[PDB]
Paper text:
Pyrrolnitrin, a potent antifungal compound originally discovered in Pseudomonas strains, is biosynthesized through a secondary metabolic pathway involving four key enzymes. Central to this process is [name], a heme enzyme that catalyzes the complex transformation of 7-Cl-L-tryptophan. While heme enzymes are known for their abilities to catalyze redox reactions, the reaction catalyzed by [name] is unique and complex, involving C-N bond cleavage, C-N bond formation, C-H bond activation, and decarboxylation. Naismith et al., established that [name] belongs to the indoleamine 2,3-dioxygenase (IDO) and tryptophan 2,3-dioxygenase (TDO) superfamily due to its high structural similarity.
In the previously reported complex structures of [name], the indole rings of 7-Cl-Trp and Trp bind to [name] in distinct conformations, while the amino groups of both ligands directly coordinate with the heme. Consistent with our spectroscopic data, the binding conformations of 7-Cl-Trp and Trp are nearly identical, with the amino group directly coordinating to the iron center, while the carboxylate group is stabilized by interactions with Gly210, Gly211, Ser319, and a heme propionate group. There are two notable differences when comparing our FbPrnB structures to those of PfPrnB. First, a previously disordered loop in PfPrnB (residues 323–331) becomes ordered in FbPrnB structures (residues 312–323), where it plays a role in stabilizing the substrate carboxylate group through Ser319. This loop closes over the substrate-binding site in the presence of ligands, likely aiding the enzyme in positioning the substrate correctly for efficient catalysis. The difference is primarily attributed to the substitution of Val117 in PfPrnB with Tyr104 in FbPrnB, which reduces the size of the active site pocket and restricts the indole positioning in FbPrnB. In contrast, the binding poses of 7-Cl-Trp are similar between the two homologs, likely due to the 7-chlorine substitution, which locks the indole ring into a similar orientation in both structures. Due to the strong binding, the measured KD for 7-Cl-Trp may represent an upper-limit determination, and the actual value may be lower than what is reported.
Residue numbers in the entry: 0 to 348
The structure:
Amino acid sequence: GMISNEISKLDPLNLDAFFNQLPSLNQNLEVSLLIDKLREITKSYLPTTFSINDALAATRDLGMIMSSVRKLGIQPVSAVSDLEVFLETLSEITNMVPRETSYHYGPWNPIGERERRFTHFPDERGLIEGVRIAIPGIELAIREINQLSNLSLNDPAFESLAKSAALHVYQAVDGIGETIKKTDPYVFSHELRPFFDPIRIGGKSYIGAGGGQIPLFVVDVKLWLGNHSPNSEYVSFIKDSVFYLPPELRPICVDSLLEPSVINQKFAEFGSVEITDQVIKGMESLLSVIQVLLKFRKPHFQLAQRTLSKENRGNYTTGSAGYTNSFNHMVLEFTIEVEKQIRAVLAPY
Ligand code: HEM
Ligand SMILES: N[C@@H](Cc1c[nH]c2c(Cl)cccc12)C(=O)O
């Protein structure tokens, strides 16, 4: 478990003053100052001496300087070739990618004066608050949904855990609503999106931080996807994402991809045991969770559609992971289909 407060409060590379300048440096395209800071960092710090929390915060801070350079069109590790050993040492300690993710940008990013930010645009706050709210709640919902596999539908503990998970997933809904109300789609495409492009590090390419990196897909795999669609595009996105996750989430995701999902296994229990009143309540509680997922994916799809429109898309047709809104349409159709299947099983009652 990575406690966010213990990471957000760190400044292991003494960059707090620099991050008050960074929005202005990025505005004036001052690539010399960005590159000079990367060079100073590799000479000023023995990263092998860092604790885990220090290395996570360093990844957060160094990652944002790197993404700023990449935003100008320069591969930062090709320009500062000593970065590669530095980043490699850091990722040995974190056992995470040598690059920042949504985790670094949201929950590990401090609130207030020290908040790390690429730009001066307040639309940026919409992305930061979006993932900073979404991630902790989704993580609690993962712990709770994981316990459902080992409870009976007829146990009120089942229904109560699923309800808790639905409440915690609502944090993803609150997160995307913060984005819808603060982030203008046109300012996103033209001012924010360019900071989330891929960076070549040790001969492979790491996508930038993205909303898709909140572990919502982990909820999906345990809850409905399981091992049921082996060749889908969504299982390929998840495949590519497992090792971007914090280590503690990786076994949950891997085992869930290799097992039947909760809803599939609870469908079997339902149509084979004595269907009582607690059992309907328990099955009703799984549909509640799914319906919360839709309360996220429906407005998310609209937001992505206004942003990728001809008028609004700027220079991009994809998200940071290389997909169009078609991918969102497919994840959301998958979820609508589970809601239909659950409502079918319940219709007699
Ligand atoms: C202007 C704002 C946004 C746009 C244009 C946008 C668009 C997209 C796009 C194009 C994808 C496809 C995957 C990829 O290529 O990376 C995607 C995936 C995803 N994004 Fe966003 N997004 C926005 C804001 C957010 C926010 C704030 C969050 C979370 C708080 C979020 C969460 C997700 C998730 C969870 C996925 C994976 C698909 C799913 O589970 O439905 N997005 N988004
Ligand atoms: N969710 C979209 C747009 C996006 C890029 N970076 C983000 C961040 Cl860092 C937070 C929230 C959303 C986004 C994507 O995954 O590329």
